[PDB]
Coordinates of C-alpha atoms and ligand atoms in Angstrom, one line a residue:
Chain A
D1 CA -8.2 -7.4 7.5
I2 CA -10.6 -5.5 5.3
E3 CA -10.8 -6.8 1.7
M4 CA -11.0 -4.2 -1.1
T5 CA -12.6 -5.6 -4.2
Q6 CA -12.0 -3.6 -7.3
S7 CA -13.9 -4.2 -10.6
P8 CA -13.1 -4.4 -13.5
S9 CA -9.4 -5.4 -13.2
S10 CA -8.9 -3.8 -16.7
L11 CA -11.1 -1.4 -18.7
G12 CA -11.2 -0.6 -22.4
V13 CA -11.7 3.1 -22.8
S14 CA -12.1 5.6 -25.7
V15 CA -11.4 9.3 -25.4
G16 CA -14.5 11.4 -24.5
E17 CA -16.4 8.4 -22.9
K18 CA -17.9 8.3 -19.4
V19 CA -16.2 5.5 -17.4
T20 CA -17.0 4.0 -14.0
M21 CA -15.0 1.7 -11.7
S22 CA -16.2 -0.3 -8.7
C23 CA -14.6 -0.7 -5.2
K24 CA -16.4 -2.9 -2.7
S25 CA -15.1 -3.3 0.9
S26 CA -15.7 -6.4 3.1
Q27 CA -16.4 -4.0 6.1
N28 CA -18.4 -0.6 6.6
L29 CA -16.1 2.5 6.1
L30 CA -18.8 5.0 7.3
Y31 CA -17.8 6.5 10.7
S32 CA -21.0 7.4 12.6
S33 CA -19.5 10.3 14.6
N34 CA -18.4 12.3 11.5
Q35 CA -20.5 10.7 8.7
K36 CA -17.5 10.3 6.5
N37 CA -16.5 7.3 4.5
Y38 CA -12.9 6.3 5.1
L39 CA -12.3 5.6 1.4
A40 CA -9.7 7.1 -0.9
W41 CA -8.9 6.8 -4.7
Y42 CA -5.4 7.0 -6.1
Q43 CA -4.3 7.3 -9.7
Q44 CA -1.0 5.7 -10.8
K45 CA 0.2 6.7 -14.2
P46 CA 2.9 4.4 -15.8
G47 CA 6.4 4.8 -14.4
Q48 CA 5.0 7.2 -11.7
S49 CA 4.1 6.9 -8.1
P50 CA 0.3 6.8 -6.8
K51 CA -1.3 10.2 -6.5
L52 CA -4.3 11.1 -4.2
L53 CA -7.4 11.7 -6.4
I54 CA -10.4 11.5 -4.0
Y55 CA -10.7 11.2 -0.2
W56 CA -13.7 11.0 2.1
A57 CA -15.1 8.9 -0.9
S58 CA -16.3 12.1 -2.7
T59 CA -13.9 15.0 -1.9
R60 CA -11.6 15.8 -4.9
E61 CA -8.0 16.6 -4.0
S62 CA -6.5 20.1 -4.9
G63 CA -5.9 20.2 -8.7
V64 CA -8.0 17.2 -9.5
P65 CA -10.3 18.0 -12.5
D66 CA -14.1 18.1 -12.3
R67 CA -14.2 15.0 -14.6
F68 CA -13.2 12.7 -11.7
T69 CA -16.2 12.0 -9.4
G70 CA -16.4 9.8 -6.3
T71 CA -19.7 8.2 -5.2
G72 CA -20.8 5.6 -2.7
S73 CA -21.3 5.0 1.1
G74 CA -20.6 2.2 3.6
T75 CA -19.5 -0.7 1.5
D76 CA -20.0 -0.1 -2.2
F77 CA -18.0 2.7 -3.9
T78 CA -17.6 4.0 -7.4
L79 CA -15.2 6.4 -9.3
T80 CA -16.5 8.3 -12.4
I81 CA -14.5 9.9 -15.2
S82 CA -17.0 11.9 -17.4
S83 CA -15.3 12.6 -20.9
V84 CA -12.1 10.6 -20.6
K85 CA -8.8 12.3 -21.7
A86 CA -5.6 10.5 -22.9
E87 CA -3.7 11.7 -19.8
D88 CA -6.3 9.7 -17.7
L89 CA -4.9 6.3 -18.8
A90 CA -3.5 4.9 -15.5
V91 CA -4.3 2.3 -12.8
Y92 CA -6.8 3.4 -10.3
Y93 CA -6.5 2.1 -6.7
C94 CA -9.0 2.4 -3.9
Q95 CA -7.9 2.3 -0.2
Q96 CA -9.7 2.0 3.2
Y97 CA -8.1 4.2 5.9
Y98 CA -10.7 3.3 8.6
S99 CA -8.8 0.6 10.5
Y100 CA -5.4 -1.2 10.6
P101 CA -4.0 -2.8 8.4
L102 CA -4.6 -0.1 5.9
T103 CA -5.7 -2.1 2.8
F104 CA -5.8 -1.4 -1.0
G105 CA -7.7 -2.8 -3.9
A106 CA -6.1 -4.7 -6.8
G107 CA -6.7 -1.7 -9.1
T108 CA -8.4 -0.9 -12.4
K109 CA -6.1 -0.4 -15.4
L110 CA -7.5 1.9 -18.1
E111 CA -6.4 0.9 -21.5
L112 CA -7.2 2.5 -24.8
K113 CA -9.6 0.7 -27.1
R114 CA -9.2 -0.2 -30.7
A115 CA -10.3 -2.8 -33.3
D116 CA -9.7 -6.5 -32.4
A117 CA -6.3 -7.4 -33.9
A118 CA -5.1 -11.0 -34.4
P119 CA -1.5 -11.7 -33.4
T120 CA 1.4 -12.0 -36.0
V121 CA 3.1 -15.3 -34.8
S122 CA 6.7 -16.0 -35.6
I123 CA 8.8 -19.1 -34.5
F124 CA 12.6 -19.0 -34.3
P125 CA 14.9 -22.0 -33.9
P126 CA 17.9 -21.7 -31.6
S127 CA 20.8 -19.9 -33.1
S128 CA 24.0 -21.8 -34.1
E129 CA 25.8 -19.4 -31.8
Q130 CA 23.8 -20.6 -28.7
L131 CA 24.1 -24.3 -29.6
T132 CA 27.9 -23.9 -29.3
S133 CA 27.3 -23.0 -25.6
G134 CA 25.3 -26.2 -25.1
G135 CA 22.0 -24.3 -24.7
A136 CA 19.0 -24.3 -27.0
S137 CA 16.2 -21.6 -26.8
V138 CA 13.2 -21.7 -29.2
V139 CA 11.5 -18.2 -29.4
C140 CA 8.0 -17.4 -30.4
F141 CA 6.6 -13.7 -30.8
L142 CA 2.9 -13.0 -30.8
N143 CA 3.0 -9.4 -32.0
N144 CA 0.5 -6.6 -32.4
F145 CA -2.8 -8.2 -31.1
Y146 CA -5.9 -6.7 -29.5
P147 CA -7.3 -7.4 -26.8
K148 CA -4.5 -8.2 -24.4
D149 CA -5.8 -11.6 -23.3
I150 CA -3.9 -14.4 -25.1
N151 CA -2.7 -18.0 -24.6
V152 CA 0.4 -19.8 -25.8
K153 CA 0.9 -23.5 -26.2
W154 CA 4.3 -25.1 -26.9
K155 CA 4.4 -28.4 -28.9
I156 CA 7.5 -30.7 -29.3
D157 CA 6.8 -33.5 -31.9
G158 CA 3.1 -33.0 -31.5
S159 CA 2.9 -33.2 -27.7
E160 CA 2.5 -30.3 -25.2
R161 CA 5.4 -28.8 -23.2
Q162 CA 5.3 -26.6 -20.0
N163 CA 8.9 -26.8 -18.5
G164 CA 11.5 -24.3 -19.6
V165 CA 8.9 -21.9 -21.0
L166 CA 9.3 -18.2 -19.9
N167 CA 6.9 -15.5 -21.1
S168 CA 7.0 -11.7 -21.3
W169 CA 4.2 -9.2 -22.3
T170 CA 4.7 -5.6 -23.6
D171 CA 2.5 -2.8 -22.2
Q172 CA -0.1 -1.3 -24.6
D173 CA 1.7 0.3 -27.7
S174 CA 1.7 4.1 -27.5
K175 CA 1.3 4.3 -31.3
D176 CA -1.0 1.4 -32.6
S177 CA -2.7 0.5 -29.2
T178 CA -1.8 -3.2 -29.6
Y179 CA -0.2 -5.8 -27.3
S180 CA 2.7 -8.1 -28.0
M181 CA 4.0 -11.2 -26.2
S182 CA 7.3 -13.1 -26.2
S183 CA 7.5 -16.9 -25.3
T184 CA 10.9 -18.6 -25.0
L185 CA 11.3 -22.4 -24.7
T186 CA 14.8 -23.2 -23.2
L187 CA 16.2 -26.8 -23.3
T188 CA 19.7 -28.2 -23.6
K189 CA 21.5 -28.8 -27.0
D190 CA 21.0 -32.6 -26.4
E191 CA 17.4 -32.4 -25.5
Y192 CA 16.8 -30.1 -28.5
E193 CA 18.7 -32.5 -31.0
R194 CA 16.5 -35.4 -29.9
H195 CA 13.3 -34.0 -31.5
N196 CA 12.2 -32.9 -35.0
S197 CA 9.1 -30.6 -35.0
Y198 CA 8.8 -27.6 -32.7
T199 CA 5.7 -25.5 -32.6
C200 CA 4.0 -22.6 -30.7
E201 CA 0.2 -22.5 -30.7
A202 CA -1.5 -19.0 -30.2
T203 CA -5.1 -18.9 -28.8
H204 CA -6.8 -15.5 -29.2
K205 CA -10.4 -14.0 -29.2
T206 CA -10.0 -13.1 -33.0
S207 CA -10.2 -16.8 -34.0
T208 CA -12.0 -20.0 -33.0
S209 CA -9.0 -21.9 -34.4
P210 CA -5.5 -21.4 -32.9
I211 CA -2.7 -19.7 -34.9
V212 CA 0.1 -22.4 -35.3
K213 CA 3.7 -21.6 -36.2
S214 CA 6.1 -24.6 -36.6
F215 CA 9.6 -25.6 -37.7
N216 CA 11.4 -28.9 -38.2
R217 CA 14.9 -29.3 -36.8
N218 CA 15.9 -31.7 -39.7
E219 CA 14.6 -29.2 -42.4
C220 CA 17.8 -27.3 -43.5
Chain B
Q1 CA 7.6 22.0 -4.9
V2 CA 6.2 20.2 -1.6
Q3 CA 7.3 16.5 -2.1
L4 CA 8.7 13.4 -0.5
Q5 CA 12.3 12.7 -1.5
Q6 CA 13.3 9.1 -1.5
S7 CA 16.9 7.4 -1.5
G8 CA 18.4 5.8 -4.6
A9 CA 18.0 2.2 -6.1
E10 CA 19.4 -0.7 -4.1
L11 CA 21.1 -4.0 -5.1
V12 CA 21.4 -6.4 -2.2
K13 CA 22.5 -10.0 -1.7
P14 CA 19.9 -12.4 0.0
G15 CA 20.1 -12.7 3.7
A16 CA 21.4 -9.1 3.9
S17 CA 19.7 -5.9 5.2
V18 CA 18.7 -2.6 3.5
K19 CA 17.7 0.8 4.9
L20 CA 15.7 3.1 2.7
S21 CA 15.2 6.8 3.6
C22 CA 12.4 9.3 2.8
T23 CA 12.9 13.1 3.5
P24 CA 10.0 15.5 2.9
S25 CA 10.9 19.0 1.5
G26 CA 8.1 21.5 2.4
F27 CA 7.0 20.0 5.7
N28 CA 8.0 18.4 9.1
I29 CA 7.8 14.6 9.7
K30 CA 6.6 15.5 13.3
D31 CA 3.2 16.9 11.7
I32 CA 2.4 13.7 9.6
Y33 CA 2.1 9.8 9.8
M34 CA 4.8 8.4 7.5
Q35 CA 3.6 5.3 5.7
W36 CA 5.6 2.6 3.8
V37 CA 3.9 0.9 0.8
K38 CA 5.3 -2.1 -1.2
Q39 CA 4.7 -2.5 -5.0
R40 CA 5.8 -5.9 -6.5
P41 CA 6.4 -6.0 -10.3
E42 CA 3.1 -5.5 -12.1
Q43 CA 1.3 -6.2 -8.8
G44 CA -0.8 -4.0 -6.4
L45 CA 0.0 -1.7 -3.4
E46 CA 0.8 -3.5 -0.1
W47 CA 0.9 -1.4 3.1
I48 CA 3.9 -2.3 5.4
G49 CA 3.4 0.0 8.3
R50 CA 3.6 3.6 9.6
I51 CA 5.3 5.8 12.1
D52 CA 4.2 8.8 14.2
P53 CA 7.6 10.7 14.2
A54 CA 6.4 13.0 17.0
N55 CA 6.6 10.1 19.6
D56 CA 8.3 7.2 17.5
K57 CA 5.1 5.0 17.8
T58 CA 4.7 2.4 15.0
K59 CA 2.0 0.1 13.5
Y60 CA 2.7 -2.7 11.1
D61 CA 0.9 -5.2 9.0
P62 CA 1.7 -8.6 10.7
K63 CA 2.8 -10.0 7.2
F64 CA 5.8 -7.6 7.7
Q65 CA 6.4 -8.5 11.4
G66 CA 10.1 -9.4 11.7
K67 CA 10.8 -8.1 8.1
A68 CA 10.2 -4.4 8.3
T69 CA 11.4 -1.7 10.8
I70 CA 10.2 1.8 10.4
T71 CA 12.1 4.6 12.3
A72 CA 12.2 8.4 12.2
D73 CA 14.9 11.1 12.6
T74 CA 13.4 14.6 13.4
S75 CA 16.9 16.2 13.3
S76 CA 17.3 15.3 9.6
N77 CA 13.5 15.3 8.9
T78 CA 13.8 11.8 7.6
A79 CA 11.8 8.6 8.0
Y80 CA 13.4 5.1 7.4
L81 CA 12.4 1.6 6.3
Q82 CA 14.7 -1.3 7.2
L83 CA 14.2 -4.7 5.5
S84 CA 16.1 -7.6 7.1
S85 CA 16.9 -11.2 6.0
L86 CA 16.2 -10.3 2.4
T87 CA 14.7 -12.8 -0.1
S88 CA 13.7 -12.6 -3.7
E89 CA 10.2 -11.8 -2.3
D90 CA 11.5 -8.4 -1.1
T91 CA 12.4 -7.4 -4.7
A92 CA 9.9 -4.5 -5.2
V93 CA 9.5 -0.7 -5.4
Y94 CA 9.0 0.8 -2.0
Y95 CA 7.1 4.1 -1.6
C96 CA 6.9 6.4 1.4
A97 CA 3.6 8.2 1.8
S98 CA 2.4 10.7 4.3
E99 CA -1.1 10.7 6.0
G100 CA -1.6 14.3 7.1
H101 CA -3.4 15.7 10.2
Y102 CA -6.2 17.9 8.9
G103 CA -8.6 18.2 11.9
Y104 CA -10.3 14.8 11.5
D105 CA -9.9 11.4 13.1
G106 CA -7.5 10.1 10.4
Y107 CA -6.9 10.8 6.7
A108 CA -5.8 9.4 3.3
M109 CA -2.2 9.3 2.0
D110 CA -2.0 12.8 0.4
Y111 CA 1.7 12.8 -0.4
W112 CA 3.8 10.0 -2.1
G113 CA 7.5 9.7 -2.8
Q114 CA 9.1 8.8 -6.1
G115 CA 9.7 5.2 -5.0
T116 CA 12.9 3.1 -4.3
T117 CA 13.8 0.0 -6.3
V118 CA 15.2 -2.8 -4.2
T119 CA 16.6 -5.8 -6.2
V120 CA 17.6 -8.9 -4.1
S121 CA 20.0 -11.2 -5.9
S122 CA 23.1 -13.5 -5.4
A123 CA 24.3 -12.7 -8.8
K124 CA 27.3 -10.7 -9.8
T125 CA 27.9 -8.5 -13.0
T126 CA 27.5 -10.8 -15.9
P127 CA 27.5 -9.6 -19.5
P128 CA 24.7 -10.7 -21.9
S129 CA 25.0 -13.3 -24.7
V130 CA 23.4 -11.8 -27.8
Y131 CA 21.8 -14.3 -30.2
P132 CA 20.2 -13.5 -33.6
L133 CA 16.6 -14.5 -34.3
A134 CA 16.2 -15.4 -38.0
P135 CA 13.2 -17.3 -39.4
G136 CA 13.6 -21.0 -40.1
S137 CA 15.2 -22.0 -43.6
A138 CA 11.6 -23.2 -44.8
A139 CA 9.2 -20.2 -44.2
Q140 CA 8.4 -17.0 -46.3
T141 CA 5.1 -15.8 -47.9
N142 CA 4.4 -12.4 -46.2
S143 CA 5.1 -8.8 -47.5
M144 CA 6.7 -8.2 -44.0
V145 CA 9.4 -10.2 -42.1
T146 CA 9.8 -10.4 -38.3
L147 CA 13.4 -10.8 -36.9
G148 CA 14.6 -10.8 -33.3
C149 CA 17.5 -10.5 -31.0
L150 CA 17.8 -12.7 -27.8
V151 CA 19.7 -11.0 -24.9
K152 CA 20.4 -13.9 -22.5
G153 CA 22.0 -14.3 -19.1
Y154 CA 22.9 -10.8 -17.9
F155 CA 23.0 -9.1 -14.5
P156 CA 22.0 -6.5 -13.5
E157 CA 19.3 -4.5 -15.4
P158 CA 19.2 -2.4 -17.6
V159 CA 20.2 -3.4 -21.2
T160 CA 19.4 -1.1 -24.2
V161 CA 18.4 -2.6 -27.6
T162 CA 18.4 -0.5 -30.8
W163 CA 18.1 -1.7 -34.4
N164 CA 20.4 -0.3 -37.1
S165 CA 21.6 2.3 -34.6
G166 CA 18.1 3.7 -34.0
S167 CA 17.3 4.0 -37.8
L168 CA 14.7 1.2 -37.4
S169 CA 12.4 2.7 -34.8
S170 CA 9.0 1.7 -36.2
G171 CA 8.1 -2.0 -36.1
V172 CA 10.5 -2.4 -33.1
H173 CA 9.4 -3.4 -29.7
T174 CA 11.4 -4.8 -26.8
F175 CA 9.9 -7.3 -24.3
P176 CA 10.4 -6.7 -20.5
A177 CA 13.2 -8.8 -19.0
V178 CA 12.5 -12.0 -17.1
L179 CA 14.6 -13.6 -14.4
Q180 CA 15.9 -17.1 -15.8
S181 CA 18.2 -18.9 -13.3
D182 CA 19.4 -15.9 -11.2
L183 CA 20.2 -13.8 -14.4
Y184 CA 18.0 -11.8 -16.9
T185 CA 16.8 -12.7 -20.4
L186 CA 15.2 -10.3 -22.8
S187 CA 14.2 -10.3 -26.5
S188 CA 13.6 -7.5 -29.1
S189 CA 11.4 -7.9 -32.2
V190 CA 11.8 -5.9 -35.5
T191 CA 9.4 -6.0 -38.5
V192 CA 10.7 -5.0 -41.9
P193 CA 9.3 -5.3 -45.5
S194 CA 10.3 -8.8 -47.1
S195 CA 12.0 -6.6 -49.8
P196 CA 14.9 -5.2 -47.6
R197 CA 15.7 -8.5 -45.8
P198 CA 17.9 -10.5 -46.4
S199 CA 18.9 -8.2 -49.3
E200 CA 19.7 -5.3 -46.9
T201 CA 21.2 -5.1 -43.3
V202 CA 19.2 -5.6 -40.1
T203 CA 21.5 -5.4 -37.0
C204 CA 20.6 -5.2 -33.3
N205 CA 22.8 -3.1 -31.1
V206 CA 22.8 -4.3 -27.5
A207 CA 24.4 -2.3 -24.6
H208 CA 24.8 -3.5 -21.0
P209 CA 26.3 -0.4 -19.2
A210 CA 27.1 -2.4 -15.9
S211 CA 29.5 -4.9 -17.6
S212 CA 30.8 -2.1 -19.9
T213 CA 29.7 -4.2 -23.0
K214 CA 28.4 -3.2 -26.4
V215 CA 27.5 -6.0 -28.9
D216 CA 26.3 -5.6 -32.5
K217 CA 24.6 -8.7 -34.2
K218 CA 23.8 -8.7 -37.9
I219 CA 20.6 -10.8 -38.5
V220 CA 21.8 -13.2 -41.3
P221 CA 19.5 -16.0 -42.9
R222 CA 19.7 -19.5 -41.2
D223 CA 22.7 -21.5 -42.6
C224 CA 20.7 -23.3 -45.4
Chain C
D1 CA -8.4 5.9 50.1
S2 CA -8.8 6.3 46.3
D3 CA -6.9 5.7 42.9
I4 CA -8.5 8.1 40.3
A5 CA -7.5 7.4 36.7
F6 CA -8.2 9.6 33.6
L7 CA -8.4 8.2 30.1
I8 CA -8.5 11.2 27.8
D9 CA -9.3 11.1 24.0
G10 CA -6.6 12.8 22.0
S11 CA -8.0 12.0 18.5
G12 CA -7.6 14.4 15.5
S13 CA -11.2 15.9 15.7
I14 CA -10.4 17.6 19.0
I15 CA -9.0 21.1 18.0
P16 CA -6.0 22.4 20.1
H17 CA -8.2 24.9 22.1
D18 CA -10.6 22.0 23.1
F19 CA -7.7 19.7 24.1
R20 CA -6.4 22.7 26.2
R21 CA -9.9 23.0 27.8
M22 CA -10.0 19.3 28.6
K23 CA -6.5 19.5 30.3
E24 CA -7.8 22.5 32.2
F25 CA -10.9 20.4 33.3
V26 CA -8.7 17.3 34.3
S27 CA -6.4 19.7 36.4
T28 CA -9.3 21.4 38.2
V29 CA -10.8 18.0 39.0
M30 CA -7.6 16.8 40.6
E31 CA -7.3 20.1 42.6
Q32 CA -11.0 19.8 43.9
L33 CA -10.7 16.0 44.7
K34 CA -7.3 16.6 46.6
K35 CA -7.3 14.2 49.6
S36 CA -4.5 12.7 51.7
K37 CA -5.1 9.0 50.4
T38 CA -6.3 10.2 46.8
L39 CA -3.8 9.4 43.9
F40 CA -4.4 10.2 40.2
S41 CA -3.1 8.7 37.0
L42 CA -3.5 9.7 33.3
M43 CA -3.5 8.0 30.0
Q44 CA -4.2 9.6 26.6
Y45 CA -5.5 7.4 23.8
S46 CA -6.5 7.7 20.1
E47 CA -5.0 4.9 17.8
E48 CA -1.8 5.3 20.0
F49 CA -1.7 5.1 23.9
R50 CA 0.5 7.2 26.3
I51 CA 0.7 7.1 30.1
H52 CA 1.4 10.8 31.0
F53 CA 1.8 10.0 34.8
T54 CA 1.5 6.9 37.0
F55 CA 0.0 6.9 40.5
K56 CA 3.7 6.6 41.8
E57 CA 4.7 9.6 39.6
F58 CA 1.9 11.6 41.1
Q59 CA 2.8 10.5 44.7
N60 CA 6.4 11.9 44.1
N61 CA 5.0 15.2 42.5
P62 CA 1.4 15.8 43.8
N63 CA 1.1 19.0 41.6
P64 CA -1.8 18.5 39.1
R65 CA -0.9 21.5 36.9
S66 CA 2.8 20.5 36.8
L67 CA 1.8 17.0 35.4
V68 CA -1.0 18.1 33.0
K69 CA 0.8 21.2 31.4
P70 CA 3.3 19.1 29.3
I71 CA 0.6 16.6 27.9
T72 CA 0.7 16.9 24.0
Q73 CA -2.1 15.6 21.7
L74 CA -1.5 12.2 19.9
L75 CA -4.1 12.8 17.0
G76 CA -5.4 10.0 14.8
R77 CA -8.4 7.6 15.1
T78 CA -10.4 6.3 18.2
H79 CA -9.6 3.1 19.9
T80 CA -11.6 3.4 23.3
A81 CA -11.8 -0.3 24.2
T82 CA -7.9 -0.8 23.8
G83 CA -7.5 2.4 25.8
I84 CA -9.8 1.0 28.7
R85 CA -7.9 -2.3 28.7
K86 CA -4.6 -0.4 28.9
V87 CA -5.9 1.7 31.8
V88 CA -7.1 -1.5 33.7
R89 CA -3.8 -3.5 33.0
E90 CA -1.2 -0.7 33.2
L91 CA -2.5 2.2 35.3
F92 CA -4.2 0.0 37.9
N93 CA -0.9 -2.2 38.5
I94 CA 1.1 -2.2 41.8
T95 CA 4.3 -1.5 39.8
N96 CA 2.8 1.8 38.7
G97 CA 2.0 2.9 42.3
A98 CA -1.6 1.5 42.4
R99 CA -3.0 0.4 45.8
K100 CA -4.5 -3.1 46.3
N101 CA -7.5 -2.2 48.7
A102 CA -8.1 1.4 47.3
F103 CA -11.2 2.5 45.4
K104 CA -10.6 2.1 41.5
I105 CA -12.2 5.0 39.7
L106 CA -11.9 5.9 35.9
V107 CA -13.1 9.1 34.2
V108 CA -13.3 8.6 30.4
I109 CA -13.5 11.9 28.3
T110 CA -14.3 11.5 24.5
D111 CA -15.5 13.5 21.6
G112 CA -16.6 10.5 19.4
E113 CA -17.4 6.7 19.1
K114 CA -14.7 4.1 18.9
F115 CA -14.0 2.8 15.3
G116 CA -11.6 0.3 13.7
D117 CA -10.5 -0.8 17.3
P118 CA -9.0 -4.3 17.4
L119 CA -10.9 -4.8 20.6
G120 CA -14.6 -4.9 21.4
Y121 CA -16.2 -3.4 24.5
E122 CA -17.1 -7.2 25.4
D123 CA -13.3 -8.0 25.5
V124 CA -12.6 -5.0 27.8
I125 CA -15.7 -4.2 30.1
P126 CA -15.9 -7.6 31.9
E127 CA -12.2 -7.4 32.9
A128 CA -12.8 -3.8 34.3
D129 CA -15.9 -5.0 36.3
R130 CA -14.0 -8.1 37.8
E131 CA -11.0 -5.7 38.7
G132 CA -13.5 -3.4 40.5
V133 CA -13.1 -0.4 38.1
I134 CA -15.8 2.3 38.8
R135 CA -16.2 4.0 35.3
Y136 CA -17.4 7.5 34.6
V137 CA -17.9 8.7 31.0
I138 CA -18.0 12.3 29.5
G139 CA -19.4 12.3 25.9
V140 CA -18.6 15.7 24.3
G141 CA -20.5 17.2 21.4
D142 CA -22.7 16.1 18.5
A143 CA -21.2 12.6 18.2
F144 CA -23.6 11.5 21.0
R145 CA -26.9 12.9 19.7
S146 CA -28.2 9.6 18.7
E147 CA -29.7 6.5 20.5
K148 CA -26.9 4.1 19.2
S149 CA -24.2 6.6 20.3
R150 CA -25.6 7.0 23.9
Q151 CA -25.6 3.2 24.2
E152 CA -21.8 3.3 23.6
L153 CA -21.5 5.8 26.6
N154 CA -23.7 3.4 28.7
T155 CA -21.4 0.5 27.7
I156 CA -18.2 2.4 28.8
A157 CA -19.7 3.7 32.1
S158 CA -20.6 1.5 35.1
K159 CA -24.3 0.7 35.7
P160 CA -26.6 2.7 36.2
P161 CA -26.2 5.2 33.4
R162 CA -27.9 8.0 35.5
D163 CA -25.0 7.7 38.1
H164 CA -22.0 7.3 35.7
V165 CA -22.8 8.9 32.3
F166 CA -22.2 12.6 31.5
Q167 CA -22.8 14.6 28.3
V168 CA -21.7 18.2 27.3
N169 CA -22.4 20.1 24.1
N170 CA -18.6 21.0 23.7
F171 CA -15.3 21.4 25.6
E172 CA -16.1 24.9 26.8
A173 CA -19.1 23.4 28.7
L174 CA -16.9 20.9 30.6
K175 CA -16.8 23.6 33.4
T176 CA -20.7 23.0 33.8
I177 CA -20.1 19.4 35.0
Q178 CA -17.1 20.2 37.3
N179 CA -19.3 20.3 40.4
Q180 CA -21.6 17.3 39.5
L181 CA -18.6 15.1 38.8
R182 CA -16.7 16.0 42.1
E183 CA -19.9 15.3 44.0
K184 CA -20.5 11.9 42.3
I185 CA -16.8 10.8 43.1
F186 CA -17.4 11.8 46.8
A187 CA -20.6 9.7 47.0
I188 CA -19.0 6.2 47.9
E189 CA -15.4 7.7 47.8
Ligands
CA301 CA1 -12.6 12.0 17.6
CL302 CL1 -18.2 -1.9 38.3
NA303 NA1 11.2 3.6 -9.4

């Protein structure tokens, strides 16, 4: 199997910029008899299916704008977008169609850049409603932060917790270009009632020190 | 106009089988290599195999050996993908793509279908439990206040979450659902000025079409 | 006493007229080498492999043009080594009408080098030598205008290259090597 190594996994982009992605294959894709590189580039816009952008490593597909450029030969390949448009924000995959199995790269997701934004952290105790069912879920929202990379730490009475934790991340906001994340710690009513302090620690690029949001069970 | 038309969404029990179809409008399956590509949630593209509908010859990725069966029907101009002994690992979006024959030894996948969602679960239609997310009794400093809505233990997807019947649109964002037990869990966040809450009303409206349920939950300040 | 197999390239680069010209060439060869103990078999290869007629199928219908006319092009990539192994293992098998003490001859006709083949020539050539398969190769067009490419031809064909390798500019020039090929088969029948 040929390995398709795409770089970077994610790229911060501004409208009008020149951007470049890398695709490196573990085996040669240049066929000696036709002197063509068996490499294709696909663009996958959110909610949509992949669409063929470039084939033979440099040939643009019908309807593909002059802004998309494909370069490289043999092993190391590159896709270029001179003057990025908003409509170009998608995931770009490269694929080898030289031999079987046909293999794809992990992709390069283009995201819109903006100012580094620190998360707005909010902790929520379990609702009285849920406690009646016998379950207890502590929720932590880390909202409107930039860049996307963030870390959550759960703390019950000062000590770390890793079981019962379920996390969900939003896609980049279409209006303010930020990311948000939801962390939920699900215990039982009895496990929950055995402890006093509950906390979620947020670790992000914007601060050396983590953002800590806490609550005490026996505090109203 | 010229496109690959794929079959509708699938909901299957584990251990069962599922057969997906792909019919091109605009061209003949005989004149292309029909490919099948798997896309796992927020994961990459994974080639399953392909068929030459002109002679029914197939190639697969050995990872899908025993799992996938690709067939073609020239009469209905349709290519099929059958997935057997279904597990949660088979929950993905499946695309059909065609590799055309343009006078070269091979080609890229120039046409792609819209995709087919397959969801593998033992779960039956379960309505959600809607829990309010109000800040702890001892908080408050900020000019803004974040409130939430926890939509727990429902099956299947989707669920629609509005705030104040769509009136609160800004400051609202819903988190993608996650599979907890064999059921889904989701949460929605709303940010309002500290002035309108709790002095004014903040309500989440949750709708789960599948269980024919609509729930409205007023976010009220924590007991004390 | 001869079993003459053809392994024809049906890859995408060969335009329909050229595939027609090759079929014409294959037919003419079978008609010119027509002998009372001479059987013929054909396999088409690309990335897929298809037996168009077994020696037994030829014995029960010894009409070359009747057997070559229906042959349809596979298209796709070029897996020559896998094709050679399939010819050796399938065409030259007693169940497919092959004779034990008959001369095993193989004429290979290609327009390009093998690529992305699961098999190497090292995994296929020794088995062909051990099974006593006399290999002839016809490399068509520009794909064989280099030193490296001609070595591929030499690897396919039996040693020496002068007695087993052929080269034509195109498919319309296959007619040129019609006489030379027929005469080479006749030398040690
Ligand atoms: Ca070829
Ligand atoms: Cl030999
Ligand atoms: Na879909």
